[PDB]
Design a protein around this ligand. Structure first.
Ligand SMILES: [Zn+2]
Length: 46
């Protein structure tokens, strides 16, 4: 058998990088910024 946890915070504005939840798009998009910023050293991407 298994146990499935059930938390409270399911919204269409939930981030994927970390897994945060918001109410307004802006609040979310702006948050995602924390993830999208610094660049990976080396030509890995470029
Ligand atoms: Zn996030």
């Amino acid at each position: 058998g298994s146990s499935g946890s059930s938390g409270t915070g399911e919204k269409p504005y939930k981030c994927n990088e970390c897994g945060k939840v918001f109410t307004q798009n802006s609040h979310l998009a702006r948050h995602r910024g924390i993830h999208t910023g610094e660049k990976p050293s080396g030509p890995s991407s470029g």
